Design a protein around this ligand. Structure first.
Ligand SMILES: NC(=O)c1ccc[n+]([C@@H]2O[C@H](COP(=O)([O-])OP(=O)(O)OC[C@H]3O[C@@H](n4cnc5c(N)ncnc54)[C@H](O)[C@@H]3O)[C@@H](O)[C@H]2O)c1
Length: 198
């Protein structure tokens, strides 16, 4: 079995929010998103619609990801830390109800041994205890499975985002200031969630 609804999470720097609201969508790497801050070109997707991982907008099935810990620890090229990083929240069911092409994996999608699925019933193939683990570093099988991904082909409409989660009051205020510049954009919930950060 699997959680229903099935939340999906995309992390991005706050400096990218204006470009997302202006476009009305997240764009996949290969669709040239007007990103301001960076925080897969040969990793083939074997389910339709195919292409490579950079053809999809990527989500995890958990907040507080290993990627976020690399950002927190200054391991990434980006050196601004976790506090300006938003979690944009949707659900796998909303994507499927919208008829958007998607695939998802049972583990880190860059792994040659990742399995890919295209039907929400196959969410049962994922390791939900690994996805939800707070102590995820070891063993390797667990860490790989924590990074199961939900991939939406080409573009992801802003209207499907139900919540922007933030680290702090100050970041929440900055998000509300940006949303107010786009009065016709859907206004999701804005929530401070320290338990989603390190
Ligand atoms: N970001 C995540 O939550 C996430 C989820 C699962 C997997 N991953 C893995 O991490 C890698 C790096 O992730 P990434 O987030 O750099 O990946 P990405 O390939 O999605 O990079 C695109 C960047 O542009 C931003 N962006 C998209 N549309 C935009 C728009 N209209 N205006 C401005 N900015 C826009 C995205 O938020 C992101 O920061 C991925 O290639 C994947 O292997 C990331």
């Amino acid at each position: 079995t699997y959680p229903e609804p099935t939340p999906i999470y995309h992390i991005t720097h706050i400096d990218n929010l204006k470009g997302i609201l202006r476009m009305g969508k997240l764009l996949a790497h290969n669709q040239s998103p007007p990103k301001q801050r960076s925080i897969r070109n040969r990793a083939k997707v074997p389910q339709p619609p195919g292409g490579v991982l950079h053809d999809y907008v990527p989500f995890y099935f958990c907040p507080r990801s290993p990627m976020l810990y690399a950002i927190y620890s200054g391991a990434t090229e980006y050196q601004g830390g976790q506090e300006p990083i938003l979690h944009l929240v949707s659900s796998a069911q909303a994507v499927h109800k919208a008829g958007l092409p998607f695939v998802f994996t049972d583990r880190h999608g860059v792994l040659s041994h990742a399995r890919f699925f295209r039907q929400l019933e196959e969410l049962a193939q994922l390791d939900w205890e690994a996805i939800q683990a707070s102590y995820w570093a070891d063993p390797p099988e667990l860490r790989e499975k924590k990074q199961a991904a939900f991939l939406v082909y080409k573009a992801f409409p802003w209207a499907l985002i139900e919540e922007i989660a933030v680290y702090s009051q100050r970041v929440g205020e900055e998000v509300l200031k940006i949303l107010k510049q786009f009065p016709e954009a859907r206004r999701p919930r804005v929530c401070i969630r320290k338990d989603w950060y390190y």
